[PDB]
Design a protein around this ligand. Structure first.
Ligand SMILES: [Cl-]
Ligand SMILES: [Cl-]
Length: 397
């Protein structure tokens, strides 16, 4: 153990199927500065989305080294259907988090604060080649248990016949400029092609490119030839101001953006196959769009929707949840995919309350629970599955 030949057998996290059906998963990190006497490393935090972070109010988990070697280790239990991102934070610092007694639920606010000081130092798993830029400012790695559901398109990525195009969208309504990406996956009946709008376009166009997965599903006849519009959120300041129920954003998209997009490639005016898909504030904004302009956006795809907005500390209460409760807004004729993970309690509970509220006979709602959390590795699969659900009627032809 801890030898050169021993490290050769390690390809990343290892798992063992237990009696109950869950897995004992072990993580390994090789200290490049040697053993105790040589390496000045104090901590090696294991930050797994929805498992060891603030979403589970978990006490900060750090690895421990096997005395005498440069091997750090840490294990945990994970469900069979789970999938999620993770990263390690090897540091010399030991003055960030406070002490925690066994069985003490820490304050979530205190956790995020503590993590905001360490995450910039976070790194992907050097043993795992399935890594990418997380979008939050650090690299991450992918882990999937054997029964994680298939992620349509991402399993058989195929090159798109048409390359993605980029356009600079200058908004008079918003008073700012921004990038938008356009992908088309079919030329037949161009005016019948459904339009699908994806928020946080920068991520789905650069950090985790959605084109190969979309083209693959189209080639398999599991998605119709469509027109995909990815919109850049720009940055945190703008995104936090434009996505959480901001009417100008959607007014601007309809009056300024869609006509420009329509000038380059045709798409259907039928709200019934017009999708607005987003995650987190993007999910909230997509439903908000469908709720306020159902004549233009009839299909909503909300993944981990921030329906706890504006106040996170209070999950069941939400702005969109209040409008539906009184009667100002109503999902009539809308097809809605509402996804949320069990590893994001606040968000999950918020989505349940939202579901109960709008669940009437006058609309088609698809509830999807995910064994995972506030994680783009999971969302990527729900994104493609969600489009299949929202477009199920067309796809059947
Ligand atoms: Cl610490
Ligand atoms: Cl990043």
């Amino acid at each position: 153990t801890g030898s050169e030949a021993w490290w050769r057998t390690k390809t990343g996290p290892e798992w063992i199927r237990e009696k109950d059906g869950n897995y004992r998963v072990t993580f390994w990190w090789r200290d490049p500065q040697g053993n105790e006497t040589h390496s000045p490393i104090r901590r090696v935090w294991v930050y797994i989305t929805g498992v060891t972070d603030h979403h589970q109010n978990a006490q900060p988990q750090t690895m421990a080294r096997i005395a005498g070697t440069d091997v750090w280790r840490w294990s945990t239990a994970l469900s069979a259907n789970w999938r999620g991102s993770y990263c390690f934070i090897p540091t010399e610092r030991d003055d960030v988090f406070a002490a925690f007694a066994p069985g003490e639920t820490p304050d979530r606010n205190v956790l995020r604060e503590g993590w905001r000081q360490l995450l910039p130092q976070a790194i992907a798993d050097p043993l795992n080649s399935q890594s990418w830029r997380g979008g939050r400012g650090h690299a991450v790695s992918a882990l999937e248990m054997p029964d994680a559901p298939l992620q349509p398109g991402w399993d058989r990525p195929e090159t798109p016949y048409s390359p993605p195009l980029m356009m600079q969208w200058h908004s008079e309504r918003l008073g700012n400029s921004r990038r938008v990406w356009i992908l088309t996956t079919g030329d037949e009946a161009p005016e019948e092609r459904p339009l699908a709008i994806l928020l946080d376009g920068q991520f789905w166009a650069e950090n985790m490119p959605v084109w190969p997965a979309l083209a693959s599903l189209t080639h398999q006849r599991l998605l119709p030839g469509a027109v995909y519009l990815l919109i850049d959120a720009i940055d945190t300041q703008h995104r936090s101001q434009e996505l959480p129920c901001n009417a100008d954003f959607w007014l601007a998209v309809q009056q300024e953006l869609l006509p420009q997009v329509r000038a380059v490639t045709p798409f259907s005016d039928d709200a019934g196959r017009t999708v607005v898909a987003g995650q987190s504030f993007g999910g909230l904004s997509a439903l908000y769009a469908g709720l306020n302009w159902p004549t233009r956006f009839g299909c909503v795809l909300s993944q981990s929707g921030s329906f706890w907005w504006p106040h996170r500390i209070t999950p069941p209460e939400g702005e969109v949840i209040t409008r539906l409760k009184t009667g100002a807004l109503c999902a009539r004729g809308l097809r809605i995919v509402l996804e949320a993970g069990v590893r994001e309690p606040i968000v999950f509970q918020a989505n349940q309350a939202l579901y109960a509220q709008l669940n009437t006979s006058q609309q088609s709602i698809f509830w999807r629970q995910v064994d995972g959390g506030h994680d783009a590795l999971c969302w990527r699969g729900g994104l493609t599955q969600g489009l299949m659900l929202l477009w199920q009627p067309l796809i059947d032809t």
